[PDB]
């Protein structure tokens, strides 16, 4: 039961996937995140509306908020802990609807989508990750 973390789940599409080596190249190439001269792996997926536009970021499965804040690099970032080592992450937000300590219920809205250093094109998007004991996994294997 992992919720796609977007209230309106139509019109919102995955624009970047979780980087898998041992996967066709050029879809590896499309799993790179980049800024200036530097390239890195996408550790999650990136959601966004056709044309680009903001939109509300719903929690995936529920639990307590471990972090909410601006990061100069990542835009607005919230982290929610879950059962037995699980956590989800939402980054490149334009704002946040909660603070650390807040208990949250799945599909409960948090801040809209936003930009951060990794935005390519005109934005905006959300960056989403799932972690077991801090290790990131392909979120699409849960959807």
């Amino acid at each position: 039961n992992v919720a796609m973390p977007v209230v309106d789940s139509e019109n919102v599409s995955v624009v970047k996937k979780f980087y898998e080596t041992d996967a066709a190249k050029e879809e590896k190439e499309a799993a790179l995140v980049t800024y200036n001269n530097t390239y890195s792996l996408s550790k999650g997926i990136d959601l966004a509306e056709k044309d680009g536009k903001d939109f509300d970021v719903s929690a995936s499965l529920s639990g307590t908020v471990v972090k909410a804040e601006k990061d100069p690099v990542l835009g607005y970032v919230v982290e929610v802990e879950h059962a037995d080592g699980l956590s989800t992450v939402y980054q490149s937000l334009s704002e946040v609807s909660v603070e650390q300590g807040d208990k949250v219920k799945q599909n409960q809205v948090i801040g809209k989508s936003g930009k951060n250093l990794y935005s390519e094109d005109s934005g905006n998007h959300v960056h989403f990750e799932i972690r077991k004991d801090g290790v990131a996994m392909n979120p699409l294997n849960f959807m």
């Binding site: 590896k28 190439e29 790179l32 001269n37 890195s40 990131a136």
Partner: protein, 114 residues
């Protein structure tokens, strides 16, 4: 040289740990268990330095007049000397880091212009 200073001050990082560990191993007030744990760390660090050396070698092997690899952390940072840079190049580099490393979380390749 933004690259070359990248190298030099990664080597200072490394020269200072080398030094701090040795500080312990030659001290009186460190126990022989404590003194050993230090040695263990020097050893592990040297292993790291030898893999960084192989990756730089394999990397310079496709173009790239110079390469610099920091494999110490969870995320491996790679700096390369290149004027040209692309998603294409990055993958070729990432690809071969994967093949010489599992345990690998993130990789970050920077192509530094001359």
């Amino acid at each position: 040289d933004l690259f070359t200073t990248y190298r030099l001050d990664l080597e200072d990082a490394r020269s200072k740990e080398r030094e701090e560990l040795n500080a312990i191993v030659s001290s009186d007030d460190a126990t022989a268990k404590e003194k050993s744990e230090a040695y263990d760390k020097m050893t592990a660090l040297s292993e790291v330095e030898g893999t960084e050396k192989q990756l730089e070698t394999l990397i310079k092997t496709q173009g790239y007049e110079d390469a610099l690899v920091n494999a110490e952390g969870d995320k491996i940072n790679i700096t390369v000397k290149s004027d040209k840079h692309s998603k294409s190049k990055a993958t070729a580099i990432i690809d071969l880091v994967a093949k010489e490393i599992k345990t690998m979380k993130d990789v970050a390749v920077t192509f530094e212009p001359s």
